[PDB]
Amino acid sequence: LSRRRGMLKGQESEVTGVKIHAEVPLSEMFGYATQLRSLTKGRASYTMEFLKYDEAPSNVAQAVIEARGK
Amino acid sequence: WSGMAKQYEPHRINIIDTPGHVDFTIEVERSMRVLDGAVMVYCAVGGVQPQSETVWRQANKYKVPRIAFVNKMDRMGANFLKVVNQIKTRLGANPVPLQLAIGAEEHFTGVVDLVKMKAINWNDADQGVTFEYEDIPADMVELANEWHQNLIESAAEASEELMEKYLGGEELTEAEIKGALRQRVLNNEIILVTCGSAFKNKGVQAMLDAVIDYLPSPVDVPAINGILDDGKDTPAERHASDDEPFSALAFKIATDPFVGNLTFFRVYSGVVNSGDTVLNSVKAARERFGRIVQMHANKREEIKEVRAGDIAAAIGLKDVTTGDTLCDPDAPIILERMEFPEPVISIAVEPKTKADQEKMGLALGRLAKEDPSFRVWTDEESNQTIIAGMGELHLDIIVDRMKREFNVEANVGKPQVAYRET
Amino acid sequence: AKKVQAYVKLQVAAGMANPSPPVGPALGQQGVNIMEFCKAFNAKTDSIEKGLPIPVVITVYADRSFTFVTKTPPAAVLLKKAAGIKSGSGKPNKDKVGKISRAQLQEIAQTKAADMTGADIEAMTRSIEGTARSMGLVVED
Amino acid sequence: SRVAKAPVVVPAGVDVKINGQVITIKGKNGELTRTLNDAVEVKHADNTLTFGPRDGYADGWAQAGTARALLNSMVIGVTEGFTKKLQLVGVGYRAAVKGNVINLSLGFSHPVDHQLPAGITAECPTQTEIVLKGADKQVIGQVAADLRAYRRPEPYKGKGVRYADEVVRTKEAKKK
Amino acid sequence: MKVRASVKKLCRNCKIVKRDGVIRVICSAEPKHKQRQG
Amino acid sequence: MALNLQDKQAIVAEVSEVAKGALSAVVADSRGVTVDKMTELRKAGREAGVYMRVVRNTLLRRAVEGTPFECLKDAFVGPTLIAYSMEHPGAAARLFKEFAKANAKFEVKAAAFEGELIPASQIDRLATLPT
RNA sequence: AGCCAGGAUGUUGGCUUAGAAGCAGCCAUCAUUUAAAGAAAGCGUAAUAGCUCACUGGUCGAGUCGGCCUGCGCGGAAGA
Numbered sequence A: 001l002s003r004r005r006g007m008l009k010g011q012e013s014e015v016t017g018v019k020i021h022a023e024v025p026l027s028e029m030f031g032y033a034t035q036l037r038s039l040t041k042g043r044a045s046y047t048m049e050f051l052k053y054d055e056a057p058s059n060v061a062q063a064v065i066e067a068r069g070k
Numbered sequence B: 001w002s003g004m005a006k007q008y009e010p011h012r013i014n015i016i017d018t019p020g021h022v023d024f025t026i027e028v029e030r031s032m033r034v035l036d037g038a039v040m041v042y043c044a045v046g047g048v049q050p051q052s053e054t055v056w057r058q059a060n061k062y063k064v065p066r067i068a069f070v071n072k073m074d075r076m077g078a079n080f081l082k083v084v085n086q087i088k089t090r091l092g093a094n095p096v097p098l099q100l101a102i103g104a105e106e107h108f109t110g111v112v113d114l115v116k117m118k119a120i121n122w123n124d125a126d127q128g129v130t131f132e133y134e135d136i137p138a139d140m141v142e143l144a145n146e147w148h149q150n151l152i153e154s155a156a157e158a159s160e161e162l163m164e165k166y167l168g169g170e171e172l173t174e175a176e177i178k179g180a181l182r183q184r185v186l187n188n189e190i191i192l193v194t195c196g197s198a199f200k201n202k203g204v205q206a207m208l209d210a211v212i213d214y215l216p217s218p219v220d221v222p223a224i225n226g227i228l229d230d231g232k233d234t235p236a237e238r239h240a241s242d243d244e245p246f247s248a249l250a251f252k253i254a255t256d257p258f259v260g261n262l263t264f265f266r267v268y269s270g271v272v273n274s275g276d277t278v279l280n281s282v283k284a285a286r287e288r289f290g291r292i293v294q295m296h297a298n299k300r301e302e303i304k305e306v307r308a309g310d311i312a313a314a315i316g317l318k319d320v321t322t323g324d325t326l327c328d329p330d331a332p333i334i335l336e337r338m339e340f341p342e343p344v345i346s347i348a349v350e351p352k353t354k355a356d357q358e359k360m361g362l363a364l365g366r367l368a369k370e371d372p373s374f375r376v377w378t379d380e381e382s383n384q385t386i387i388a389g390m391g392e393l394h395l396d397i398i399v400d401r402m403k404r405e406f407n408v409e410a411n412v413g414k415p416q417v418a419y420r421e422t
Numbered sequence C: 001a002k003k004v005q006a007y008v009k010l011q012v013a014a015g016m017a018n019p020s021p022p023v024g025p026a027l028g029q030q031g032v033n034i035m036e037f038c039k040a041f042n043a044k045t046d047s048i049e050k051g052l053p054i055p056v057v058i059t060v061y062a063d064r065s066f067t068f069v070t071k072t073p074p075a076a077v078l079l080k081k082a083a084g085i086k087s088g089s090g091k092p093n094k095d096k097v098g099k100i101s102r103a104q105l106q107e108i109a110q111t112k113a114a115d116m117t118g119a120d121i122e123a124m125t126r127s128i129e130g131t132a133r134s135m136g137l138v139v140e141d
Numbered sequence D: 001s002r003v004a005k006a007p008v009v010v011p012a013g014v015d016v017k018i019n020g021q022v023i024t025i026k027g028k029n030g031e032l033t034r035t036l037n038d039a040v041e042v043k044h045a046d047n048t049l050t051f052g053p054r055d056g057y058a059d060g061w062a063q064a065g066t067a068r069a070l071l072n073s074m075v076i077g078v079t080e081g082f083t084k085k086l087q088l089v090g091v092g093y094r095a096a097v098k099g100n101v102i103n104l105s106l107g108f109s110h111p112v113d114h115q116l117p118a119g120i121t122a123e124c125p126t127q128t129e130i131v132l133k134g135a136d137k138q139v140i141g142q143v144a145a146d147l148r149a150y151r152r153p154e155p156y157k158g159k160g161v162r163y164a165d166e167v168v169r170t171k172e173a174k175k176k
Numbered sequence E: 001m002k003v004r005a006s007v008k009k010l011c012r013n014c015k016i017v018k019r020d021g022v023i024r025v026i027c028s029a030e031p032k033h034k035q036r037q038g
Numbered sequence F: 001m002a003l004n005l006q007d008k009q010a011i012v013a014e015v016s017e018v019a020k021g022a023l024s025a026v027v028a029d030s031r032g033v034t035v036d037k038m039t040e041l042r043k044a045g046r047e048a049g050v051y052m053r054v055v056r057n058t059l060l061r062r063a064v065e066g067t068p069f070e071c072l073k074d075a076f077v078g079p080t081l082i083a084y085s086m087e088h089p090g091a092a093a094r095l096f097k098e099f100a101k102a103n104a105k106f107e108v109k110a111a112a113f114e115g116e117l118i119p120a121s122q123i124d125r126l127a128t129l130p131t
Numbered sequence G: 001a002g003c004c005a006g007g008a009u010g011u012u013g014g015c016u017u018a019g020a021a022g023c024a025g026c027c028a029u030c031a032u033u034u035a036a037a038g039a040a041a042g043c044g045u046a047a048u049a050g051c052u053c054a055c056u057g058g059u060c061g062a063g064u065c066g067g068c069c070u071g072c073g074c075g076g077a078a079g080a
């Protein structure tokens, strides 16, 4: 989750699992579970829900300006 | 299946095999409520594994009475007792071993039963289909004695009178042992585990006998809870016997290679007969019930009659989605199940030819009805379609089904992230 | 006997000692139950204070037995809502440790001298005296 | 240094024979003989065995300490002998023994039979572990390293031939 | 290993050795710190 | 980091209190936790006094330089590891025996409390309360 | 150097009332206890664990430890 440009906010451990909260950007999550299952031996799942907005320097959005609908 | 050398009349055992991938887990979700029991297969060397615990949770949600098979005793490094203990400590179950292993790998020839107290070594050499009992084998007699004694203690704690009778120094008969073990296996007490090797065809012949001995019947499993459209709870317990009006449960639409519908339907109560009328009580829709088909011995038998507990499939036009009830106009409308998994992986998709967006629209429309664990989307940043599925493979075996079923090719892509600026 | 395998030195606000999903990912791998988790550590802590983490032991038995003698929150640890300043150590040279008086600091070092004992009570007194100045600012009286 | 400047005190019942440079030590286990580097002076001297650097040989003290340690090991071999213990971790890894041949079943398609050198007797108290016994330290260490090299331990699941005391430093496969 | 023209101890656990006229580093703890020449 | 000056100073400082003081005890504790050598030391400081440092001084000439001032036969503590504690309250008091009492209870070993020939005592307990 | 234990009671130092938990969020801390606790520099790092900073304690008893200047060498050093 830290590899992804995501920030963790608390990780309470309930029994038989650990509950880990982190407001990760959506761009850094487009195949998460398959990788997460590799990381968890297929014993974990993730639930994500949009919260807010912030910035990270990426002219990749300048890369996608004139490719479609200039 | 009549019985392995001990037989008791034709039983139509009805079998739904289950897949093993979390990717396509809805076929295990729908096919666990529809089930009365479940044979929890296991790898005698792999043991219990991510999917085994996953399907364990699946069954626990429906409290299905489950017995377990332990396959793969020929592979080197396989040991029945270790996997048995794994169940005891990886799933929090009470794994009563109603069998035992005679050897491992090459050694495997038979299994020590704790009630017959014999170990039948099948005649695999001519054909597995032939079988033979053997009196009290010395190799496992000390191990079997201690493990069999353990089984009697479970039979005892099974009934209160029995417990005290077990404290009477007296043993248990060929009916109180099983009837004690069975009568609560119906109620989610303990999972019976038998070992075998479907490759070498041993253990299995006995496994079928255990299913009759302990796995529940539609008359043994408790009666089904029911409800109407408005009455918060019309009890609607449909007594299983087909004396109530016809009341089934449809669990899977099918892309039949020829028919195009083949929605399987599991009849709990009542009797539909080669042409009747029932409504989509979950959808508020009406249509007839034409051509029931039940496939047995791999021959696709066509049936004009389907009854209580009788698993079959239907050819029709009007859609019945998975977990949708097929009750009579009497209508115990809603059955409690209204659950489908939310998609865990969402990927964009678009055809290779720019004019098959309509065809890819209609194909994904159909492939979205065929399983509920597969959403299709239209996000508003752009018209781009998003095929949100459960797993990578779940929606990777659908990008090529369009290639196979609907002869349309698509090119997937990462979804476009909504980027607003300020 | 069993202190070695389960191990988390952590105490959240002890209005309820050790709430189950409140602490963090070290006690999740700890079989200790919640039935007696905050019964005698939310009420019997009144020997020092209520609202401060009750310093306790993490000793249970493999036979499911649980015995321990809980210590108290420090007089410096209590210096977040009881001794005034919510700020404290790390910046006692760039900030104040609070309007702390030694007319109270010595009394607190003497009356809270039960858990950390010694040959002479002045030893635990100097212990707490270094504990407060472990921030860098202590009552100069 | 203070290695060679320390006598190898022979036990009771061992027969040492310092013939020139090459030297034999007889014992209860067997017989070990060693050709000392010519830069070493060794005497019996009343139940001991002492080494001293010959004159004209700048590397006299290195060879002195070396020869002293080697003869100490030879003595301990002829009286006690050294016993190496190996284990087979990994599923289906079994190492049954037939006389002077260790039949290792270590996962290769081909069968593995390492014919022991003269002097090392391998036994297996279990399907999956070897216990080498021998008279010479160097050759038993060599046989252990020979067996271990067939299926060396690996950094992920410890599978392979390992010494009983070996501390295999493992690691995780990947994040992925 | 690395064949840098300059071997140095990268860890507390590394050792300088001169096997066969080549100056190697043999770190028992981290096998990345294992160096050959120079 | 015990320098020679500091060495001769500390040996003399820990030997003077025992030389002009009373009969004390020592232990042989090479395997104990901070807690075991700590609570026993607190007990020992409560019994007699807080002057005793629990550090050990069993070097081959630590006691062979301090104990040999008078009653030099009391220089028999060289071979085994030792961290002593004084007992001003009476010869062969509880402190001169509490170490050996705890030798098998919550403590490793107590060097048998060899004693010292201050009055040239023999095998017996020096103080008996006739009371 | 080798060989026999330990590296607190504030001790999760309060230390940005999520902890960066003896060793990343920042800092100044033996204060009985001392040979110990540094209150941080890898294994977890979020703890533990057993090694870790070090240090004594015992064991046996001869030099050892670093840097500086230096002579000759060593690797750096691959072409048809």
Ligand SMILES: [Mg+2]
Pocket: none
């Ligand atoms: Mg040069």
Ligand SMILES: [Zn+2]
Pocket: E010, E011, E013, E014, E027, E028, E029, E030, E031, E032, E033, E034
């Ligand atoms: Zn290194």
